[PDB]
Amino acid sequence: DVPDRIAGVAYPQGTTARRLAQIGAVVTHDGDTLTVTPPSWRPDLRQPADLVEEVLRLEGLEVIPSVLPPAPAGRGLTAGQQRR
Amino acid sequence: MRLPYSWLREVVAVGASGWDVTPGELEQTLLRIGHEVEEVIPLGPVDGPVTVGRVADIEELTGYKKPIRACAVDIGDRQYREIICGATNFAVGDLVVVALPGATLPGGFTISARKAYGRNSDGMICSAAELNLGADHSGILVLPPGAAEPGADGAGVLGLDDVVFHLAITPDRGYCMSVRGLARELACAYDLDFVDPASNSRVPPLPIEGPAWPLTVQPETGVRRFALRPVIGIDPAAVSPWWLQRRLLLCGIRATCPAVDVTNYVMLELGHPMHAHDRNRISGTLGVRFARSGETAVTLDGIERKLDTADVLIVDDAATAAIGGVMGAASTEVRADSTDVLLEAAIWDPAAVSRTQRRLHLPSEAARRYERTVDPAISVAALDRCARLLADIAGGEVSPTLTDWRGDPPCDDWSPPPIRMGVDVPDRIAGVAYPQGTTARRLAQIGAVVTHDGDTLTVTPPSWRPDLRQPADLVEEVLRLEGLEVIPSVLPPAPAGRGLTAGQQRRRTIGRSLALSGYVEILPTPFLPAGVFDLWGLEADDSRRMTTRVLNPLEADRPQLATTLLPALLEALVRNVSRGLVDVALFAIAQVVQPTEQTRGVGLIPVDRRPTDDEIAMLDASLPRQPQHVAAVLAGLREPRGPWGPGRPVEAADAFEAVRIIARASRVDVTLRPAQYLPWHPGRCAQVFVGESSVGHAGQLHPAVIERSGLPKGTCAVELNLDAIPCSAPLPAPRVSPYPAVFQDVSLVVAADIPAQAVADAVRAGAGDLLEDIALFDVFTGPQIGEHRKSLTFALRFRAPDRTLTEDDASAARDAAVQSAAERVGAVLRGWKLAA
Numbered sequence: 001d002v003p004d005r006i007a008g009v010a011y012p013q014g015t016t017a018r019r020l021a022q023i024g025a026v027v028t029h030d031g032d033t034l035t036v037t038p039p040s041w042r043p044d045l046r047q048p049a050d051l052v053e054e055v056l057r058l059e060g061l062e063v064i065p066s067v068l069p070p071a072p073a074g075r076g077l078t079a080g081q082q083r084r
Numbered sequence: 085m086r087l088p089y090s091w092l093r094e095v096v097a098v099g100a101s102g103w104d105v106t107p108g109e110l111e112q113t114l115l116r117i118g119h120e121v122e123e124v125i126p127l128g129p130v131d132g133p134v135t136v137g138r139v140a141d142i143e144e145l146t147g148y149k150k151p152i153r154a155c156a157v158d159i160g161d162r163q164y165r166e167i168i169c170g171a172t173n174f175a176v177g178d179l180v181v182v183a184l185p186g187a188t189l190p191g192g193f194t195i196s197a198r199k200a201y202g203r204n205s206d207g208m209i210c211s212a213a214e215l216n217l218g219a220d221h222s223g224i225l226v227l228p229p230g231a232a233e234p235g236a237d238g239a240g241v242l243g244l245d246d247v248v249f250h251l252a253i254t255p256d257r258g259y260c261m262s263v264r265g266l267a268r269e270l271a272c273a274y275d276l277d278f279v280d281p282a283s284n285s286r287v288p289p290l291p292i293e294g295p296a297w298p299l300t301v302q303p304e305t306g307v308r309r310f311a312l313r314p315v316i317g318i319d320p321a322a323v324s325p326w327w328l329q330r331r332l333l334l335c336g337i338r339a340t341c342p343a344v345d346v347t348n349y350v351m352l353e354l355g356h357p358m359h360a361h362d363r364n365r366i367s368g369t370l371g372v373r374f375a376r377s378g379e380t381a382v383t384l385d386g387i388e389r390k391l392d393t394a395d396v397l398i399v400d401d402a403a404t405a406a407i408g409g410v411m412g413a414a415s416t417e418v419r420a421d422s423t424d425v426l427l428e429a430a431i432w433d434p435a436a437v438s439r440t441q442r443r444l445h446l447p448s449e450a451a452r453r454y455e456r457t458v459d460p461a462i463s464v465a466a467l468d469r470c471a472r473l474l475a476d477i478a479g480g481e482v483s484p485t486l487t488d489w490r491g492d493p494p495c496d497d498w499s500p501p502p503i504r505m506g507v508d509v510p511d512r513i514a515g516v517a518y519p520q521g522t523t524a525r526r527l528a529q530i531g532a533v534v535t536h537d538g539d540t541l542t543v544t545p546p547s548w549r550p551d552l553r554q555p556a557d558l559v560e561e562v563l564r565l566e567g568l569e570v571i572p573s574v575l576p577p578a579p580a581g582r583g584l585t586a587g588q589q590r591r592r593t594i595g596r597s598l599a600l601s602g603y604v605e606i607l608p609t610p611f612l613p614a615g616v617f618d619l620w621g622l623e624a625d626d627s628r629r630m631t632t633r634v635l636n637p638l639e640a641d642r643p644q645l646a647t648t649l650l651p652a653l654l655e656a657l658v659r660n661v662s663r664g665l666v667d668v669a670l671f672a673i674a675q676v677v678q679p680t681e682q683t684r685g686v687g688l689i690p691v692d693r694r695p696t697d698d699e700i701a702m703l704d705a706s707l708p709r710q711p712q713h714v715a716a717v718l719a720g721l722r723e724p725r726g727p728w729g730p731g732r733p734v735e736a737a738d739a740f741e742a743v744r745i746i747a748r749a750s751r752v753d754v755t756l757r758p759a760q761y762l763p764w765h766p767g768r769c770a771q772v773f774v775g776e777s778s779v780g781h782a783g784q785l786h787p788a789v790i791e792r793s794g795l796p797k798g799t800c801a802v803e804l805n806l807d808a809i810p811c812s813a814p815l816p817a818p819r820v821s822p823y824p825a826v827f828q829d830v831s832l833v834v835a836a837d838i839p840a841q842a843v844a845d846a847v848r849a850g851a852g853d854l855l856e857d858i859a860l861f862d863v864f865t866g867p868q869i870g871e872h873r874k875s876l877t878f879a880l881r882f883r884a885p886d887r888t889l890t891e892d893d894a895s896a897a898r899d900a901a902v903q904s905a906a907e908r909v910g911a912v913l914r915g916w917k918l919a920a
Contacts (some may be wrong), residue, residue: 070577 126215128190160235173223258456262355306433609651848906
């Protein structure tokens, strides 16, 4: 579900594994943990972040919602900034 | 509410014997649970010979200003000392308190055998104040006969190891204005068993064998309970024992006679006020009824009260007995010869007492407890406690007759409705996980009946707690008894905000901009000076005179709210000038009050729902217009004196420049047009326009206004309506041509009456896009051009966007500009020049 978390979207089931298959990787399931072996023409695919971008771009980035984060109580501008 | 620690300790001790705590700890515990402690007074200490004495002989010393007394005082062991005293509230045979040579009174006074008024004085006879025992009043302290023998130790007789707590009880805790209530609060705080001093084990009920007096009650007066019991054949000359007179004095009450003293004592003890009527002075049936228009009553203090048809009285066939809940009347007052007493234990309507006492300025001890709701369940118990005590002191019987009107139909059960609340609700509101069973244990301590139904408690508060009536109310009880200090500090996440609004950002920029240019901001007052518009000479129908009016101003001649900020500004100017600060520029940004119709109030809307958009619109429309203004005043030197020169006095142009500062700060363009408008000078006043909307005025003040007002000669002023200046958020994209400019100077002769800006506009209009800048240099008059004409010399800077301007191309643009000024303002060219 790592691509689901990063995108903030609940992708249909088997989406991350189908898309990684299309790009030519060997995908195997062990409960909640996939093992993904990318193809030789894809030396860029080498951490989980890299695999997220493949899922997210093939599903389209337009489906990602706009959600303001809660930012904590800030301290505002500093003295030096206010002085300039 | 003052009360002493010993009494409070005694009541707490019944159910937790041996309880005792320092004043410090008591103060802290009281604050922690919600009771403001205003002062802690331990009773001022004495050292040495401060003993009871008996006055054995009085000799009036004559020949001095006041009456003076040389007294022989029996001080013990058959020693008689001569003592000078200036009071008069004592006779031969009276127990007093003497401080003898070697004694030290509170405040660090040492007593010494002095000579005064021609005799030797071996000390002094003390007042309750001089001993820091109670409030200072006229005369010395007199103890009741049999309180102590002459020679007894003053500190022990008077109980000076006691401490008085002065509290400020909040109006939601009326039950706390008595030893009963505060003692209960301490038993809750300290986790003690509590024996209620109003309960039956502690006040056994007297007999009930027929009515004690005929009574009719108009129930729409709000009376909830009304009880009478008599005590007959009391000694009119008995006095209250020392312990009782003392407790009253520490509580702020001067004792007078057992009939009165016992009702004040039970009031302090149980929180139910009481009153004693001379029964033989009542004529016929007691009636509780509203007062009639114009009616009068004379209260105990012999002062005639003008009544109001919302005041509840007690009357009889002859006259008024009481302003119910506020103060008894003279006609049934206990007095020196009163032998048969009728005791009143009533429960009045809180809102009724509140209105009546505020209106009459009688915030009596009774009224203040009724305002905050007295426990109706204890009226007879307070009555019986009061009757027994009166009989015991002054020796009569308590008649077994009793009236006890309890509503129609009679109310037998005084408990409020039950409240349903989730068991963890106090935990949520506090943000604390309280130990299990905490909310239900604490609600039990405060006397409520608590029952569990899974996760939902049902809580029925006691009768003395009419404030406990929603779940929120119950949360505060849990949280305050556990302590508020246990609640953690947790910043909430607030959402992405939008920052300050345009208008807010604009008012800051206007203030920074005026302050840099040398203006000092004042906080204006909204209350106008008396007759300011007569001083300005405003017409009768001038809109500024239609003012909203306050009804209870702190100055009776300044009740009008300001339709203009200049009065307050001019007032601060006058103050600065009168303190020697004569070169001053002041400004204000504040709202005015401009009413439209008459003062139309809107009727009450139910608060069990939110008001509808229409109801809000109607409320808004009922209020006066209240736009935001900016205004300024200037007097004295605008530029100060220094090495550069003598400085420059304020002129009207400086107020015009203040418009331009505000407008630059607002990012809008203004035009100034000649205008006549008080309080300004008619030839030095400008009306300010943004586009075609008037936004205010600026210029010099009318010299007659300045003179009538006591203002500095030459004072200038500016006022703009900020609500009339529209928002602008420009997105500029300036064309910045780098090709060389051509500078030419042109002089135009026009009628004196034509404004300079009109001539500039005309020159700009005809010159077109090549004119990069125009600026007025000279304004010349003289005979050779016309007695009513004037020469204006403008500096023109031309620049092309795509090329170097030839000089003939510039002169064509000038010719067009000169022709435009001809066609629009009748200008005549006088000469031109190639600015070198």
